[PDB]
Design a protein around this ligand. Sequence first.
Ligand SMILES: Cn1c(=O)c2c(ncn2C)n(C)c1=O
Ligand code: FES
Ligand code: FES
Ligand code: FES
Ligand code: FES
Ligand code: FES
Ligand code: FES
Ligand SMILES: [Fe+3]
Ligand SMILES: [Fe+3]
Ligand SMILES: [Fe+3]
Ligand SMILES: [Fe+3]
Lengths: 334, 334, 335, 334, 335, 334
Amino acid sequence: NDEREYLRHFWHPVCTVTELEKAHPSSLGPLAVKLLNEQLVVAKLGDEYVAMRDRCAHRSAKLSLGTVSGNRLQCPYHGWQYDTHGACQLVPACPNSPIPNKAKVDRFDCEERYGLIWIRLDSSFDCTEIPYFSAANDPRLRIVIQEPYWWDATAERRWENFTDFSHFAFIHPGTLFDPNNAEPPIVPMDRFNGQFRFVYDTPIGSFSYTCSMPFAINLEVSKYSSSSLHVLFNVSCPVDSHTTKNFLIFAREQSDDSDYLHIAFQDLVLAEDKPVIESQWPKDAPADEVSVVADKVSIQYRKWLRELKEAHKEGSQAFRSALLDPVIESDRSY
Amino acid sequence: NDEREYLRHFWHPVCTVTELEKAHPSSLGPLAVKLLNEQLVVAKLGDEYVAMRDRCAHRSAKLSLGTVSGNRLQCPYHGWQYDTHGACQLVPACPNSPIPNKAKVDRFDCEERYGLIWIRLDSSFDCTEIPYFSAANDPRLRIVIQEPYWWDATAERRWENFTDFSHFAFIHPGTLFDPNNAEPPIVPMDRFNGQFRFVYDTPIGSFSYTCSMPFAINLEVSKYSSSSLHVLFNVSCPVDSHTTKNFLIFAREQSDDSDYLHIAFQDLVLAEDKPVIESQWPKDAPADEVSVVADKVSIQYRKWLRELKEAHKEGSQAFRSALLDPVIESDRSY
Amino acid sequence: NDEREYLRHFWHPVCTVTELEKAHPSSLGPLAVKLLNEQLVVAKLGDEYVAMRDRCAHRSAKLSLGTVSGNRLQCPYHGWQYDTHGACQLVPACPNSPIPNKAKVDRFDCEERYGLIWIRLDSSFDCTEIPYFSAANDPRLRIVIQEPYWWDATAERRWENFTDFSHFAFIHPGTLFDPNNAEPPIVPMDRFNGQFRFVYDTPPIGSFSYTCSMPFAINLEVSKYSSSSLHVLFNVSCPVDSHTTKNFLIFAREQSDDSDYLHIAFQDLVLAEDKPVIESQWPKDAPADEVSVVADKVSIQYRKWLRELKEAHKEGSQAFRSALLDPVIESDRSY
Amino acid sequence: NDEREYLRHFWHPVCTVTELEKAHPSSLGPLAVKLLNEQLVVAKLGDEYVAMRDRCAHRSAKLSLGTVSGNRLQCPYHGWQYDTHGACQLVPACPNSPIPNKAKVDRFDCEERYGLIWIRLDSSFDCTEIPYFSAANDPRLRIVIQEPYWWDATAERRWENFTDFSHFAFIHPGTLFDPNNAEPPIVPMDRFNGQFRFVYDTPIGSFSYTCSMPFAINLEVSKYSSSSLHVLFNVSCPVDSHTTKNFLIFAREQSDDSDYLHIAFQDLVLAEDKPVIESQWPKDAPADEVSVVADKVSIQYRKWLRELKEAHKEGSQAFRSALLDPVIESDRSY
Amino acid sequence: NDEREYLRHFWHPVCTVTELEKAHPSSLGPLAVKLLNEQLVVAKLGDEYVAMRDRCAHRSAKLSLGTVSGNRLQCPYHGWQYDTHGACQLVPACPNSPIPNKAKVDRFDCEERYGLIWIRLDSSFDCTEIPYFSAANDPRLRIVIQEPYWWDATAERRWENFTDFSHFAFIHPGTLFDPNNAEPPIVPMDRFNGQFRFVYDTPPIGSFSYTCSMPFAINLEVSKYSSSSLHVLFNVSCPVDSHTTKNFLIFAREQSDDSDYLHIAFQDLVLAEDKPVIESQWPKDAPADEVSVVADKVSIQYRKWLRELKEAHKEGSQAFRSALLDPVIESDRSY
Amino acid sequence: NDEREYLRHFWHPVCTVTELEKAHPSSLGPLAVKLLNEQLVVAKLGDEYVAMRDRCAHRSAKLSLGTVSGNRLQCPYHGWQYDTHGACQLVPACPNSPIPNKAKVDRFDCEERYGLIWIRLDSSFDCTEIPYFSAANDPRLRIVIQEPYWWDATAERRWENFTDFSHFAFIHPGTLFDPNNAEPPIVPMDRFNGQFRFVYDTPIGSFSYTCSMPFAINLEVSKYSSSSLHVLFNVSCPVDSHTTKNFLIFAREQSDDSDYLHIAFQDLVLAEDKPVIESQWPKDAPADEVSVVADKVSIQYRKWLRELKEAHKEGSQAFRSALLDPVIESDRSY
Ligand SMILES: Cn1c(=O)c2c(ncn2C)n(C)c1=O
Ligand code: FES
Ligand code: FES
Ligand code: FES
Ligand code: FES
Ligand code: FES
Ligand code: FES
Ligand SMILES: [Fe+3]
Ligand SMILES: [Fe+3]
Ligand SMILES: [Fe+3]
Ligand SMILES: [Fe+3]
């Protein structure tokens, strides 16, 4: 409870734009979402995506059962109308009386990017950004947004699953395992602008990771001397202490083939991981877990996370340094 | 539960007579019911309706899985027989041994009225009565008891919903909303014999409310110089901290039409209310809720409940004064 | 709560051998089980039945989703292999590096007996044994292991239901109730070798002899003289958590030319009659306000003994062993 | 269907008044019903209960999905309005054009009696009446209408089951079987005004049957020198070749007890019969069935049905004689 | 019955391209479909969409449970491989023996157009084409293919529902009904190139222009002048069997900066309003006793033309082609 | 319909003995079964297994809802009692009157063998036997009876699936396919005593088939010079024209391992075959199916079946010759 609080300073995806537009016949929302156990409502007021606590100030009805009416969100119960800043500007029963000062609900940072809606619950440290998706605005690439998949596992466990290759022989023997390259060498890892960066070579191929902390992964797969660029972007929304809503976007240079060739393969990979990751208990990794040399990526990830957690208690400047100070191990220049 | 102890002193409805008769083929019960989170069992023993704790004194089996045999409720496990006062009168395994003095279960006030079964858990203040239903013993009126309806909402929030008119335009636009009277004014409210009394007029008819504290509403709808008296009697059973079992009885002078004309309209109104009331959270009204002048009825209701809660803690005489002292705002003379 | 602590010192059944062999196509397990709210995994590793915590030391995946390979249990995630002592012997990703010292999981005493798998979670007092079943190794008897049955009731309440007959007229009027024998009298009860022993004679030429291995096992021998028709029932509850039991019934009979299903149907009917009443008892553990009568002697004596065991366990190994194994005889019988 | 044409001349119950009122929020219907495999729609238009074919004349939509508006049944597709005689009186698309003469649907006799809706599909023989229920207009008796019960069995097999006593020891050992009277003797049976009449005595009471052909049974149970008259009225609606919708009405002098005491006992009796009657196959009694002397009631029933079937084919006068000619076996004088 | 026979001569849609690619992880199919009670399989074999009878010639297994291998459809049972003409080219069990002459399955004309797969079961008259969709290859329009919807109603009854407006006040009172325009008058109807053409003007400055490719396809263009807000709806029913249609809706719009889901929700609501009424019509095919009024001209003309086609088909190829393609003009318009 | 009639002359399994004993608490049945679209009832009367048409002669109730009472099967409706020959010997309602000659139901050959109940519907040709299971009464072998498995496929199609190896590469690539012996040679097949016999060698191993016509297969798998005998016995009950209830028995010499090792493997094999065989249509193999040289077994099977079918029309002696005349292709001596 105390230990998840620093996660409120990051931007997290809560839904696709498609899900918001399908939520209500108007295509404007409202849509109820949950983030870090907070009940929120998302709507499009004018040209602005807005996110508020899903709870009217008057008698606590859920705004997510209400209606968007121009530049206002209208509560279903007695019709109070809230503006983009969460302040009531119309009490229909008392339309000439002054509106109480307390007639306001909490409003949160809310922004569309890459076809997802992102929410940042706490902006007080002013140093976090929506994660990096390298394929955005690259006209060589066809971009496809998959439907979200829900797992009974935490965002940390899902991240460590995504960036590990030790498990291919046992979970993915027919899909991702390469029998002639069964053990990946330890690779150098760099911290730069709040991202982990690391690259694996075959050099016939290349797996280039840019991971915006804490839960987003951008993987570029290129074949050298060939035009086979494939990008996977995966980000987990920490819905509550046990549950993730996960988003996978993929982009590809060679787009003459079917989208569903890649979707079916990706779904097979996910279905192989899913029961094993859901079995991990307790849901958060305890201090007694035993690491080996091949676990470099997750060891370093856990190391960074607890630095961020300690820096959050020390305040805005400690946190900004912990997040954004470079730490270079490789030969690359940034 | 500390905060709802004072509710144990009121009469609460727990089932209809029909539900009790239908529970078991005997037609005498037993029927399990829950009131203020207490598990009770109701039965008809001889000519009397009885309510007991649903827990055998011997080995704690549910008496509600037992059998009514004349004027005994027989436990299903070892067949101990309990009389109308909750005292065991037969131990079948030791039929000539004396029955231990501890072989009794708590027995509560239990009375039929208007075709409902009513239970008062604590009679020690001796100053509460079954709520007032004005159509009873009026031979001009046909009386119908609807089937009970369960809501995931508290009795307080249900009462506030029933007595509010600000919500009609938004929840009931095509059923109850009157655009010829879109904002009923604030009215005088009287306290008299433990009831709230208040009337709303046309601007030719009237809505006359007699509300027996804490959870019953008697509403007489008249149209002037017509034989068109309609009466709605609604009462919420506070089952536990998040649930109500609700009862609606209605009476009408004009009785040549179908009962189901009124039931289907009343059910449609209830269905419009239900999702919004059940969305309200937290279940009990917290202090941060924001009232406006049009909430007079709700504000005064919350105030009286607070007074009853405080007076209960001060004892029998304080509670009795808080409940039955008259407080008149209108020009009426009772 | 902490009042269950002393129960970890006994052997409890967790599954049938059949359940273990059906769990996984290899017929070696693994199988997940739960005992006193502990999540365990059972597998057949070589010629041994082994019980471990169902949690890999590396990244906490469930070993019960993995595979037996040779004499080892292999985790489904990164393939660490654990031996019969719970120690990791292979890290596939680092096959030449040294295996970390803490690469191990807790292991528990585990044994097959009578076609059930038994686990003891705490062996430090070392004074308890697997319950007694009188029919094993008796070639006159056909033995049948029933499918386990799950009840939303504690093991103590289940034991008291099995040993009571006050309830026959009301729960079993058409199955077990005998109208010409409605009141079995109170009988002497012996403590011996950590068992309750007590015998009901028929005055109708028979006998019901109970040997109840504390805390949750019951061996009932029925003799219908003067006939060669011995019938043995063996019932034991696994305390799965604070609310739930997984129950095992094994029955044996001398006259075994009739159908097994004649007996299984009858027993299943008896169990179905008991089930809703026992599951309705609340709260789940019997509080101090229950009102006993003279006919409840067996139940009263059972609760007194569990209370002694629970108090002796707080005073340590030697006190517990005396409470469990000291004899207390009140019948006229030899031992 | 060739063999059941003669049944169209009788009055058959299709629903209770309650079912009709509950079908749609209007309380006026429409309700879809099926009789002798004909799809019909029932509605209350003005003061009249009407039955029509459930098939609009225009484009064959189901009128049962439409709306009752006063004294019109409105088709849901293009809104044609049908009056109480089945004639279209408004074509909304051509409101001043004349309505084609073919714009009518077949309309059938439809009458309320005893709280049931009754339909006679063919009135051309003008010699059949709604079955006799002896307790109607007896002010000493409380009358209760049970909910209808559907069986996968024909109306003939249901009737034979209700009037047989040979089965009590085997289907009803603990409910109806009397070991003090284990084999009721064969009795005289009378034909009178289209009814079978027969009485069984004690060896102090009597079972007096008045059976209006073909599917109704009126059973008066008396105990001598007591005010204990019980009446059961049972009638099967022949829905199609393998299904009945059955109606049970019961009346009683002693009315201080619960209606549900009797309903639950009557429902238990029905539940004992149901699986055996539904197992009978083929659904219609073939010629190879083997009767014994104790089947007198069933044998004479089958004979009268055969005569009615033959007489129908010979025409109105033959059918009327076959139905209403008296055939007396008893010493009674009607 | 045999009254459906003439329908085999037209092109009918059977699935979306999306449905075909999702069917099997290879994204090449195969996918089982049903058209006029024929069980077919569709697969992408090389650069061609191919339709065959979904029944192997060897032992009658369903090819739709098999696999595309190269440019061939391989049966799941014994692995016979069929080419784009339905001829077996490999018998894995007898790889050197000659392949039996009758080792082949029926194949059918199959083409992609507008993102749907179309099949013609009988090509012997060779005079029908794939229906016309006015929005294809118009770069001013955003085109959206909806998910197919299944109704328990025939394709003829579905077509008459789509082209009627008599029903708006009663089925669509809050969606399509216009209170200031409740009675669209009767309009002239043209037959041209096997299409019905007819146009409704607004006296409210608009236009509804129908091009209906017989028998079951409807292209509706809506112009809301004087604005650049052209909207095109294209609806076509697949007659799956005597009782059932699988329906495809494609819509196109010029103003495409709003959400696709604004339009999809509205259209889905319209369809949900129609569905129970249309499915309630009985019997499934309209009998001779239905009573028409003057407002039903479109429906009356539609049924007359289908009757001609059905009669011309019994007289052969040349008669059918004239019935389908002869012009019959009653408007004042150019063609 | 006409074409399945010759199948009534063979013995077919309808249930396990276990299923019969579990059907009713008595362990004696009755159990309803279906064979070649006939509704039958099976019960144990004394020491005899009996099979009758599931239809009482009196009023056609199902005897399978009745009760075994010593040496009688008692109908649930009016309690008629049938003896082991299907003749009613007690009419409870008329216990002294002569029982009608027609009071009899059809009785069929019924016999236990190998833990299954077999029924022969037509014994008129007197030349068929219960199929051969080679492991019965071999004390070296542990015998296990699996639970029956139901397929939506005919008995002929299931038989041809069981005796074919062409399909291993495609249906069983991981279970039964042997990559170094991918094409089995054509083998000689012998007809002897109504069995097909044929043997496949590896000679390190051996698959020896004895197939009692028409639906039973006995497969002995032995490794030469080793004691690895494994027997599979599979027989299909032709329940109706589209459905089989299939029985698998297996026996093994090495029985120190778990029964469920073999059961799990066998279930995996069956689950691989099942969707492909259920897809075959039409359900019976038409004349247009195209065979290749590798289909010898099924070609010869289809050849024998149509010989039996033609011989059935020519009568008892033609059929006996067609079934039991030897036709030897191999070197073996019988
Ligand atoms: C040939 N064969 C087998 O060899 C086999 C089997 N099931 C298990 N085995 C081992 N089946 C169904 C089978 O047809
Ligand atoms: S609760 Fe939102 S306006 Fe009243
Ligand atoms: S628990 Fe009620 S009598 Fe024993
Ligand atoms: S979690 Fe078990 S090997 Fe990694
Ligand atoms: S179908 Fe009834 S009005 Fe058209
Ligand atoms: S059925 Fe297709 S290859 Fe045999
Ligand atoms: S139907 Fe079987 S005894 Fe009457
Ligand atoms: Fe993975
Ligand atoms: Fe309301
Ligand atoms: Fe009966
Ligand atoms: Fe196979």
